[PDB]
């Protein structure tokens, strides 16, 4: 595989470690997504200087905590958080 | 960093290796994105059973080949191809 594909493989696997926990095996609730981001992007989130960004994301997840989201929506949200962090994923 | 963060770091770096080549440092043309995907997702693409999916993504990139796309959009496109491959990125 390419480097990109190896990285994606790893992300796919992590997403599914969360999505299999309840209900349909490859979606998770917005409530569950909030937990995932909180733990798995802990350093990225601390690196976001404007705290309204995750405030807003999490407020949206809270507003529809039982709505299901797929990999594509997960990675979209991750990309938002990444950009807000200036792409800083390190402690 | 978490394992998710390490993987995301890798992906950020690869995107920017492409975006720095021409024009604006953090975007690339849809034509350049087609090259990026063709090379860096080569195995994933071969893994897509429905060839109308990548033909269609590529149609859009050819149609609007001079439009600039950012990291968020790159991620979105990668997610579409990945889904179509049932998340298989290995040869
Ligand atoms: Na689930
Ligand atoms: Na560029």
Curated annotation (Swiss-Prot), chains A, B:
Renumbered to this chain, region (Hinge domain) spans 38-53
Q: Which intervals hold domain EF-hand? A: 13-48, 49-84
Q: What is its main location?
A: secreted
Single Gene Ontology BP annotation: killing of cells of another organism
SMART domains recorded for this chain? Answer: S_100 (SM01394)
Q: Which residues bind Zn(2+)?
A: 16, 26, 86, 90
Question: Any idea which positions bind Ca(2+) 1?
Answer: 19, 22, 24, 27, 32
Specify the protein's topology with respect to the membrane. Peripheral membrane protein
Q: Which GO terms describe its cellular component?
A: cytoplasm; cytoskeleton; cytosol; extracellular region; nucleus; plasma membrane; secretory granule lumen
Q: In which tissues is it expressed?
A: Predominantly expressed by neutrophils, monocytes and activated macrophages. Expressed by eosinophils and macrophages in asthmatic airways in regions where mast cells accumulate. Found in high concentrations in the serum of patients suffering from various inflammatory disorders, such as rheumatoid arthritis, psoriatic arthritis, Crohn's disease, ulcerative colitis, and Kawasaki disease.
Which parts of the sequence bind Cu cation?
16, 26, 86, 90
Subunit organization: Homodimer. Homooligomer (tetramer or hexamer) in the presence of calcium, zinc and copper ions. Interacts with AGER and both calcium and zinc are essential for the interaction. Interacts with CACYBP in a calcium-dependent manner.
User: Under which name does UniProt file this protein?
Assistant: Protein S100-A12
**Which species is the source of this protein?**
Homo sapiens (Human)
């Amino acid at each position: 595989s390419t480097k990109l594909e190896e990285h994606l493989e790893g992300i796919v696997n992590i997403f599914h470690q969360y999505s299999v926990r309840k209900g349909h095996f490859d979606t998770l609730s917005k409530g569950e997504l909030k937990q995932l981001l909180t733990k798995e992007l802990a350093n990225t989130i601390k690196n976001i200087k404007d705290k309204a960004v995750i405030d807003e994301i999490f407020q949206g997840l809270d507003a529809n905590q039982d709505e299901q989201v797929d990999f594509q929506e997960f990675i979209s949200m991750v990309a938002i958080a990444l950009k807000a962090a200036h792409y800083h994923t390190h402690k």
